[PDB]
Amino acid sequence: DCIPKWKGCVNRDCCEGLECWKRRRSFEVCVPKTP
Amino acid sequence: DCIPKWKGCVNRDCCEGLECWKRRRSFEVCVPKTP
Amino acid sequence: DCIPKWKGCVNRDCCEGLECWKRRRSFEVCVPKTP
Amino acid sequence: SLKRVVWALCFMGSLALLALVCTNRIQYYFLYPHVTKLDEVAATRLTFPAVTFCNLNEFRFSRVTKNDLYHAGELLALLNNRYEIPDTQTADEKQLEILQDKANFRNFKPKPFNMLEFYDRAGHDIREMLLSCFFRGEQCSPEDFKVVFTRYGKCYTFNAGQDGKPRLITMKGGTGNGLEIMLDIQQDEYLPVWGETDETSFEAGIKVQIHSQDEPPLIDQLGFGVAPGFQTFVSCQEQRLIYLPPPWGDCKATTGDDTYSITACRIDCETRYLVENCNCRMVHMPGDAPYCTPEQYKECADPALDFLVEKDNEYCVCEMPCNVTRYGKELSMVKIPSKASAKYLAKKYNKSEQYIGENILVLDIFFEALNYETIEQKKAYEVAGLLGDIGGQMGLFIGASILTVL
Amino acid sequence: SLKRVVWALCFMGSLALLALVCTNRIQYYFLYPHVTKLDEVAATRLTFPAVTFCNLNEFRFSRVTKNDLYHAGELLALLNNRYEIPDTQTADEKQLEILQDKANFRNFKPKPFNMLEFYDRAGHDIREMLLSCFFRGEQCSPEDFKVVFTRYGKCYTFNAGQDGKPRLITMKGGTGNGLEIMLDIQQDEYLPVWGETDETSFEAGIKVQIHSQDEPPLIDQLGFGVAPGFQTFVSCQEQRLIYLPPPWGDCKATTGDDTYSITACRIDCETRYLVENCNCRMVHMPGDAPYCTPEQYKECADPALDFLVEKDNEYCVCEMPCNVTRYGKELSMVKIPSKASAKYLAKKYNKSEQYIGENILVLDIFFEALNYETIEQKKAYEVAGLLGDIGGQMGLFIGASILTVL
Amino acid sequence: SLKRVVWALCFMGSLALLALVCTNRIQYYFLYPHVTKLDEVAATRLTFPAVTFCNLNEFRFSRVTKNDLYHAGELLALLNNRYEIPDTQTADEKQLEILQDKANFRNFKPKPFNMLEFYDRAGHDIREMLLSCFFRGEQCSPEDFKVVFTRYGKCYTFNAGQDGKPRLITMKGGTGNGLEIMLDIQQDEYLPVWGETDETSFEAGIKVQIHSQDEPPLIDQLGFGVAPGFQTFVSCQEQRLIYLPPPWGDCKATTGDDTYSITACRIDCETRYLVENCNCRMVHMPGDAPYCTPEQYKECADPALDFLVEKDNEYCVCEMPCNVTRYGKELSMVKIPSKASAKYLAKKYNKSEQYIGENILVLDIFFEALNYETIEQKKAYEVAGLLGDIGGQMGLFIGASILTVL
Ligand SMILES: *[C@@H]1O[C@H](CO)[C@@H](O)[C@H](O)[C@H]1NC(C)=O
Ligand SMILES: *[C@@H]1O[C@H](CO)[C@@H](O)[C@H](O)[C@H]1NC(C)=O
Ligand SMILES: *[C@@H]1O[C@H](CO)[C@@H](O)[C@H](O)[C@H]1NC(C)=O
Ligand SMILES: *[C@@H]1O[C@H](CO)[C@@H](O)[C@H](O)[C@H]1NC(C)=O
Ligand SMILES: *[C@@H]1O[C@H](CO)[C@@H](O)[C@H](O)[C@H]1NC(C)=O
Ligand SMILES: *[C@@H]1O[C@H](CO)[C@@H](O)[C@H](O)[C@H]1NC(C)=O
């Protein structure tokens, strides 16, 4: 099942349009695909 | 009895014209009233 | 016997034209006379 | 007709250049040209900058309860999906027995809370932190710092000029004529870090920002560190520089919003975005909208806000302001305490010697000179100027126009 | 008389603008206008700044005697009204037995002392402090620092240019071409702080000031800290900027006093004031007047001097100088010792490892580039310039004046 | 003939000034005059500077073998003329047994080595050092640092733009839009200092330099320190300034060499000199020439290179470049770890608490604003300008020349 924007992607499965990105000060999460 | 300018005002009673002022690096003392 | 340029002058006797100079980060050595 | 030809040669040459140059200088005004006028002026009075400083620890553990540890607990990484302490849990000898008496969820009864009040109560307290404060030799006190919420927590802004108070001025350069503060950063009330999250941090100390009062802090982005166990002199040079609206320049002079600021536009751009994408506003953000929750934070607010400022640059275009103040700074540190005054201050504030070296810092901000400098964009060619070069001779040419038709 | 009218129309128009503009440009010179000419020049030679550095501890306890502890003792807060140690007395294990053998007033016989010589003998000693000194790769030594008294104590100014010695120059930017010193701050000889006073301090380290030789230090006000246990690079950019006397500018170009300086005027303003209000001069002040005493200090000198610089700004107006040099600086620190060289230097200077981390600092001042910049106020419109615009055409107009009267 | 005289008076006066001024303005162009045009421009895009950082320890002891300790050993002052450990030898409890098992020369069989590969293998490893790296919120990694050899050792340059990779840009001021790195300086792999030499050092930490990619580092000379156990924000202002070739200016615009740099010319000047005087080139120097040896180093390379840069200034004249970028910086530190996150990071990287405070540093470089400033030398009077003042009236005068001959 896809993972929505804003949700923690740890151990990953993002919903359509998003890439799972590791943030500087905290755990990775799914967010909008970027140029 | 009034306390003259330049004299330590600790635990206070300044002479006429002065206000007792706490200095940065040391004890409070009576000095000239200021605008 | 004279000590050539580039050689450690410690406990000194430089070859002609050089003065024995204490370097900042290390031992003194003979090098070219300077104005 | 040699001389007869010359007579008309230079006569027809005159009107050649005349209109030639004339339209040239007319064209140069169409480019709406400008010039940057740099000036160093030394006054006897400088208006002292606002100074904001946040502690790096968001809340005191001394001040957190069973209640807040429920909702908030998992956001500070002190808790599991299961409301429990991870195998990654690393914490002090005494904290165990004191953490769990507050961590017991057997027969648990919850009660409401909001992160605005949370920050307010659990956030660090300037009454506590501030051991001494002097501006220009007159003792100040906690009364003089307005509270501003930032992404750090409860924060404090000196020389606010806000709530319609006055803005302080300085009569002289150097130390005695600036602000000198002495803090206990209060490490003992620092929360434990059992893992990485936006509300938890590896560094101990404060962050400062020096702004015009007209400009709100973004201490997250624009701030500069100050460590404990150091006196730190920060010596400033006021540089004030100006821009023009188009056609000349790109700036926007807007009080439409009080006064326009990059940090200013930069902030509501997070406000609008956080609200919109999270259906919530974050505590240090303005507006009438709702506050977020620990669940809201973790799952929307926090991450969304991170993507905003770091990743996606197509959203916020924040136009270049015309009127802008900047303070150039020079920092230096010295050990405090001296090994000589250690025991004096271990007495005076009633902590251990070892404590003093960790928790005590002294911040000195001042101006090196009373001079301050300006960089201004001025209009190079103005309507008056074109009428000053072409116009006068264009009226003169239009004069010899009639005498000719005869 | 249409064309007849035009003939006089533009003819009377000519003299309209002519005198119009002419008096305008004449008026513009009356405003005594100026322009600030900014220039970046890269030479092959920079004259190296004077560098003053004070230790923060005013005197060594190693170097103080029963004698000085009588008079001075209460000024350093080491004593009571009763010549005794307060309940606020906080001091080292060994200091007791060594403090009181020097503190015994039973069968006490006093002898005279003056704070000038006190500072001289008890003040820190650059022979001791300076472990190594290099300018531009040529080993320097204590011979090269003239002693200057400041409110800190015995202090030392490198690259003095004083006592008619030469001022050093630098052929290249970067580290090897600057000054690099290595100090033992000597904390062990630091006096104890049993309470707050102007001659006692919480911080351990030095204070530096980088000035033109032409300018004396006020290290109290204009100085920048350096902490022990750090190498500190300070990398400078020479910015030299100029002003004009009136009408143009506000500056004062005065050698009447050698050369005029803010710190310069700023100092004798404390001299005159301290003398006058205290009937004494303070040791680091110039003049022929008497030195203060510990009693004089506490009860007049010290407090009066504090009110002067911090509080009362109506006394000293110190005019803006025309010729002024400023050095812009960038600082950074690194740990010293490395944990690897600890024992090397615990050997080499014969102290403990733990000692080295507290007492040892290494200061590197240099130029990043050989370039240095200037900001000059130049006269915009000069008598020559007015004669250059109006004058030439005013002589031409006065020429057609005679041919007219005919 | 009063009026008759005036008629020729001002008539002969006209051509007086005409040629007078005309040749004046003609003379002013002969001085090849210029003007420095200062401009502050705020873009939406800044090209991010290259960032080089060296560790201060040249090689890991973990990574050195019996082999290298033979040749190199005496250069690091770990050895005698006799291949033995001096009475000046000061070293750790455990290092003895581990130093000598590697120090045993009984039945010794040597094998070849070169300092280029030595630095390569024994030099510190960015795979190890770098605990985390982020540019503008996108996680980076060791892949992104090209290796540059400097007099320090193996070194690493971020945002290289080299090997034909792209140069990174920044969309916004502040922290999140810069580079943030976190290092373990690895003190445990630091070599012991038993004495002073160019390859051994008292300080622990890194050195950074921020350059245009077009400019190679001289981190020895132009670099700025960063200490362990601190977060250090370094906040930059891009200042880009320009010069003219003669006659106007002194600069040299030369791609003849890619692009001309002071550090650039400054380096091969050490190359040519080191080669020539040592009959060898030093590892971090360019060219096809041979590498030095430990014997070569000690007896020629090292000392010769020291005399070069510190002492003798008549050798290298390196001309002033026209196009030059400089980054102005503001630094600040805060303690890391907080006493709260200590145990978190003692876990996470598997070292002791005490270790973390010594070996861990976090470097944050950013721009405070997107604005950046420029100082340009522009030509004041150009051929077009002279033809614009004198030329037009010189053609007009040459016109009334013919009508006269009649
Ligand atoms: C720009 O700065 C000047 C100087 O303080 C101020 O008087 C003016 O109000 C500012 N411009 C505008 C249009 O706000
Ligand atoms: C003195 O400090 C200790 C430790 O923080 C504390 O227990 C005590 O309450 C403080 N003051 C006193 C004597 O009450
Ligand atoms: C101002 O500075 C210049 C440059 O050093 C110097 O030659 C001159 O003497 C100074 N002006 C005066 C009037 O002292
Ligand atoms: C070595 O240091 C100690 C402690 O300062 C001191 O007692 C001794 O005099 C010093 N040098 C020697 C061996 O005399
Ligand atoms: C000087 O700088 C400008 C701006 O980047 C650049 O376009 C130009 O190529 C440089 N000049 C030369 C001749 O290299
Ligand atoms: C944990 O750290 C210690 C000390 O550096 C080391 O012996 C061990 O190999 C590390 N990791 C493990 C558990 O292998």
Side-chain angles (χ1 to χ4, degrees), chain C residues 6 21-27 29 31-32 34, chain F residues 196-198 201 203 273 277-278 300 302-304 306-307:
Chain C
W6 284 201
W21 157 48
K22 159 58 183 173
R23 293 176 288 156
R24 296 192 180 187
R25 294 213 118 171
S26 203
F27 59 86
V29 301
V31 315
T34 329
Chain F
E196 301 163 49
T197 122
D198 295 59
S201 138
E203 304 89 19
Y273 185 94
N277 224 309
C278 302
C300 174
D302 255 15
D306 298 347
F307 181 88

CSV table of all heavy atoms in Angstrom, one decimal, chain C residues 5-7 21-27 29 31-34, chain F residues 196-198 201 203 273 277-278 299-300 302-304 306-307, unseen atoms left out:
chain,number,residue,atom,x,y,z
C,5,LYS,N,73.7,24.8,2.8
C,5,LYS,CA,72.3,25.3,2.9
C,5,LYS,C,71.4,24.0,3.0
C,5,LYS,O,71.8,22.9,2.6
C,5,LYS,CB,71.9,26.1,1.6
C,6,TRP,N,70.3,24.2,3.7
C,6,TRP,CA,69.3,23.1,3.8
C,6,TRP,C,69.6,22.1,4.9
C,6,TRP,O,68.7,21.3,5.3
C,6,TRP,CB,69.2,22.4,2.4
C,6,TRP,CG,68.5,23.1,1.4
C,6,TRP,CD1,67.9,22.6,0.3
C,6,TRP,CD2,68.2,24.5,1.4
C,6,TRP,NE1,67.2,23.6,-0.4
C,6,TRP,CE2,67.4,24.8,0.3
C,6,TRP,CE3,68.5,25.6,2.3
C,6,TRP,CZ2,66.9,26.1,-0.1
C,6,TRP,CZ3,68.0,26.9,1.9
C,6,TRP,CH2,67.2,27.1,0.8
C,7,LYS,N,70.8,22.2,5.5
C,7,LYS,CA,71.2,21.2,6.5
C,7,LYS,C,70.9,21.7,8.0
C,7,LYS,O,71.1,22.9,8.2
C,7,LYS,CB,72.6,20.8,6.4
C,21,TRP,N,69.1,29.7,11.0
C,21,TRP,CA,67.9,30.3,11.4
C,21,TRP,C,66.9,29.3,12.0
C,21,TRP,O,66.6,28.3,11.4
C,21,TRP,CB,67.2,30.8,10.1
C,21,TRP,CG,65.8,31.0,10.2
C,21,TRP,CD1,65.1,31.6,11.3
C,21,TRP,CD2,64.8,30.6,9.2
C,21,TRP,NE1,63.7,31.6,11.0
C,21,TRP,CE2,63.5,31.0,9.8
C,21,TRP,CE3,64.9,30.0,8.0
C,21,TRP,CZ2,62.4,30.8,9.1
C,21,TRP,CZ3,63.7,29.8,7.3
C,21,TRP,CH2,62.4,30.2,7.8
C,22,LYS,N,66.3,29.7,13.1
C,22,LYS,CA,65.4,28.8,13.8
C,22,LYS,C,64.0,29.0,13.2
C,22,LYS,O,63.4,30.0,13.2
C,22,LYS,CB,65.3,29.3,15.3
C,22,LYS,CG,64.1,28.8,16.0
C,22,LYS,CD,63.9,27.3,15.9
C,22,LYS,CE,62.6,27.0,16.6
C,22,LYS,NZ,62.2,25.5,16.5
C,23,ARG,N,63.5,27.9,12.6
C,23,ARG,CA,62.2,27.8,12.0
C,23,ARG,C,61.1,27.8,13.0
C,23,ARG,O,61.2,27.3,14.1
C,23,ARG,CB,62.1,26.7,11.0
C,23,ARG,CG,63.0,26.7,9.8
C,23,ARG,CD,62.9,25.5,8.9
C,23,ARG,NE,63.5,24.3,9.6
C,23,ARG,CZ,63.2,23.0,9.3
C,23,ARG,NH1,62.2,22.7,8.5
C,23,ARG,NH2,63.8,22.1,10.0
C,24,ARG,N,59.9,28.3,12.6
C,24,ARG,CA,58.7,28.3,13.5
C,24,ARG,C,58.4,26.9,14.0
C,24,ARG,O,58.5,26.6,15.2
C,24,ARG,CB,57.5,28.9,12.8
C,24,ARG,CG,57.7,30.4,12.5
C,24,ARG,CD,56.4,31.0,12.1
C,24,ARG,NE,56.5,32.5,11.8
C,24,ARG,CZ,55.4,33.3,11.6
C,24,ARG,NH1,54.2,32.8,11.6
C,24,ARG,NH2,55.6,34.5,11.3
C,25,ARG,N,58.0,26.0,13.1
C,25,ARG,CA,57.5,24.7,13.5
C,25,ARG,C,58.5,23.6,13.7
C,25,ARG,O,58.2,22.4,13.9
C,25,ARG,CB,56.4,24.2,12.5
C,25,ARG,CG,55.1,25.0,12.5
C,25,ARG,CD,53.9,24.1,12.3
C,25,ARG,NE,53.0,24.2,13.4
C,25,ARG,CZ,51.8,23.6,13.4
C,25,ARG,NH1,51.3,23.0,12.4
C,25,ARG,NH2,51.0,23.7,14.5
C,26,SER,N,59.8,23.9,13.5
C,26,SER,CA,60.9,22.9,13.6
C,26,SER,C,62.3,23.5,13.8
C,26,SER,O,62.5,24.7,13.8
C,26,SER,CB,60.8,22.1,12.3
C,26,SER,OG,61.4,20.8,12.5
C,27,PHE,N,63.2,22.5,13.9
C,27,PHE,CA,64.6,22.8,14.2
C,27,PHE,C,65.3,23.9,13.3
C,27,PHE,O,64.9,24.0,12.1
C,27,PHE,CB,65.4,21.6,14.3
C,27,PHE,CG,65.4,20.8,13.0
C,27,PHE,CD1,66.3,21.1,12.0
C,27,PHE,CD2,64.5,19.8,12.7
C,27,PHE,CE1,66.3,20.4,10.8
C,27,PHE,CE2,64.5,19.1,11.5
C,27,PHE,CZ,65.4,19.4,10.5
C,29,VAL,N,68.0,25.7,10.9
C,29,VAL,CA,68.8,25.2,9.8
C,29,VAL,C,69.5,26.3,9.0
C,29,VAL,O,69.0,27.5,9.1
C,29,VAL,CB,67.9,24.5,8.8
C,29,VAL,CG1,67.2,23.3,9.4
C,29,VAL,CG2,66.9,25.5,8.2
C,31,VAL,N,70.5,28.7,6.0
C,31,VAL,CA,69.9,29.2,4.8
C,31,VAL,C,70.5,30.5,4.4
C,31,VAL,O,71.3,31.0,5.1
C,31,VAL,CB,68.4,29.4,5.1
C,31,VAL,CG1,67.8,28.2,5.9
C,31,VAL,CG2,68.1,30.7,5.9
C,32,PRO,N,70.1,31.1,3.2
C,32,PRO,CA,70.6,32.3,2.6
C,32,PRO,C,70.6,33.5,3.4
C,32,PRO,O,69.5,33.9,3.9
C,32,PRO,CB,69.8,32.4,1.3
C,32,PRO,CG,69.4,31.1,1.0
C,32,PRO,CD,69.1,30.4,2.3
C,33,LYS,N,71.7,34.2,3.6
C,33,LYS,CA,71.7,35.5,4.3
C,33,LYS,C,70.6,36.4,3.7
C,33,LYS,O,70.4,36.5,2.5
C,33,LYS,CB,73.1,36.1,4.1
C,34,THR,N,70.0,37.2,4.6
C,34,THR,CA,68.8,38.0,4.2
C,34,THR,C,69.0,39.4,4.6
C,34,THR,O,69.5,39.7,5.6
C,34,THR,CB,67.6,37.4,4.9
C,34,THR,OG1,67.7,36.0,5.1
C,34,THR,CG2,66.3,37.7,4.1
F,196,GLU,N,59.3,18.8,17.9
F,196,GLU,CA,58.8,19.7,16.9
F,196,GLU,C,59.4,19.5,15.5
F,196,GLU,O,60.6,19.4,15.4
F,196,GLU,CB,59.0,21.2,17.4
F,196,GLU,CG,58.3,21.4,18.7
F,196,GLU,CD,58.8,22.7,19.4
F,196,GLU,OE1,58.9,23.8,18.8
F,196,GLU,OE2,59.1,22.6,20.6
F,197,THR,N,58.5,19.4,14.6
F,197,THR,CA,58.8,19.2,13.1
F,197,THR,C,57.7,19.7,12.3
F,197,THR,O,56.5,19.7,12.7
F,197,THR,CB,59.3,17.8,12.8
F,197,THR,OG1,58.5,17.3,11.8
F,197,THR,CG2,59.3,16.9,14.0
F,198,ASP,N,57.9,20.0,11.0
F,198,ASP,CA,56.8,20.4,10.1
F,198,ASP,C,55.7,19.4,9.9
F,198,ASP,O,54.6,19.8,9.6
F,198,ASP,CB,57.4,20.8,8.7
F,198,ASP,CG,58.3,21.9,8.7
F,198,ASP,OD1,59.4,21.9,9.4
F,198,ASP,OD2,58.1,22.9,8.0
F,201,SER,N,52.3,18.4,15.0
F,201,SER,CA,51.5,19.6,15.4
F,201,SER,C,50.9,19.5,16.9
F,201,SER,O,50.5,18.4,17.3
F,201,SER,CB,50.4,19.9,14.4
F,201,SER,OG,49.2,20.3,15.1
F,203,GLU,N,48.1,21.3,17.9
F,203,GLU,CA,46.7,21.6,17.8
F,203,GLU,C,45.9,20.4,17.3
F,203,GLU,O,46.4,19.6,16.4
F,203,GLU,CB,46.4,22.8,17.1
F,203,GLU,CG,47.1,24.1,17.6
F,203,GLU,CD,48.5,24.3,17.0
F,203,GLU,OE1,48.7,23.7,15.9
F,203,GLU,OE2,49.3,25.0,17.5
F,273,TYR,N,60.6,26.4,-7.5
F,273,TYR,CA,61.7,26.6,-6.5
F,273,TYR,C,62.0,25.3,-5.7
F,273,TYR,O,63.2,25.0,-5.6
F,273,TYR,CB,61.2,27.7,-5.5
F,273,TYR,CG,62.2,28.1,-4.4
F,273,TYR,CD1,63.0,29.2,-4.6
F,273,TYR,CD2,62.3,27.4,-3.3
F,273,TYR,CE1,63.9,29.5,-3.7
F,273,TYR,CE2,63.3,27.7,-2.3
F,273,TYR,CZ,64.1,28.8,-2.5
F,273,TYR,OH,65.0,29.2,-1.6
F,277,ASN,N,65.8,23.9,-6.2
F,277,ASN,CA,66.7,23.8,-5.1
F,277,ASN,C,66.8,22.5,-4.4
F,277,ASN,O,67.8,22.1,-3.9
F,277,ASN,CB,66.3,24.9,-4.0
F,277,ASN,CG,67.5,25.6,-3.5
F,277,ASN,OD1,68.4,25.0,-3.0
F,277,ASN,ND2,67.4,27.0,-3.5
F,278,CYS,N,65.7,21.6,-4.5
F,278,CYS,CA,65.8,20.3,-4.0
F,278,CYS,C,66.0,19.1,-5.0
F,278,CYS,O,66.2,18.0,-4.6
F,278,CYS,CB,64.5,20.0,-3.1
F,278,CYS,SG,64.3,21.2,-1.8
F,299,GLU,N,66.2,17.1,4.8
F,299,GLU,CA,67.4,17.8,4.5
F,299,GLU,C,67.3,18.9,3.4
F,299,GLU,O,68.1,19.8,3.3
F,299,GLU,CB,68.5,16.8,4.1
F,300,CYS,N,66.3,18.9,2.5
F,300,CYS,CA,66.1,19.9,1.5
F,300,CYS,C,64.7,20.5,1.4
F,300,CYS,O,64.5,21.7,1.6
F,300,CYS,CB,66.6,19.5,0.1
F,300,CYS,SG,66.2,20.7,-1.2
F,302,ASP,N,61.6,20.4,3.0
F,302,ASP,CA,61.0,21.1,4.1
F,302,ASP,C,61.6,22.4,4.4
F,302,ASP,O,61.1,23.4,4.1
F,302,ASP,CB,61.1,20.2,5.4
F,302,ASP,CG,59.7,19.5,5.7
F,302,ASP,OD1,58.8,19.5,4.9
F,302,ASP,OD2,59.6,19.0,6.9
F,303,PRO,N,62.9,22.4,4.7
F,303,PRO,CA,63.6,23.7,5.1
F,303,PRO,C,63.5,24.7,4.0
F,303,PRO,O,63.1,25.8,4.2
F,303,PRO,CB,65.0,23.3,5.4
F,303,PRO,CG,65.2,22.0,4.7
F,303,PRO,CD,63.9,21.3,4.8
F,304,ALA,N,63.9,24.2,2.7
F,304,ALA,CA,63.8,25.1,1.6
F,304,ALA,C,62.4,25.8,1.5
F,304,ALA,O,62.3,27.0,1.2
F,304,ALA,CB,64.2,24.4,0.3
F,306,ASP,N,60.2,26.3,3.7
F,306,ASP,CA,60.0,27.3,4.8
F,306,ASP,C,60.7,28.6,4.6
F,306,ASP,O,60.1,29.6,4.7
F,306,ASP,CB,60.5,26.7,6.2
F,306,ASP,CG,59.7,25.4,6.5
F,306,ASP,OD1,58.7,25.1,5.9
F,306,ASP,OD2,60.2,24.7,7.5
F,307,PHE,N,62.0,28.6,4.2
F,307,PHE,CA,62.7,29.8,3.8
F,307,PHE,C,61.9,30.5,2.7
F,307,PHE,O,61.9,31.8,2.7
F,307,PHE,CB,64.1,29.5,3.3
F,307,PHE,CG,64.9,30.7,2.9
F,307,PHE,CD1,65.6,31.4,3.8
F,307,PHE,CD2,64.9,31.1,1.6
F,307,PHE,CE1,66.3,32.6,3.5
F,307,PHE,CE2,65.6,32.2,1.2
F,307,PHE,CZ,66.3,33.0,2.2
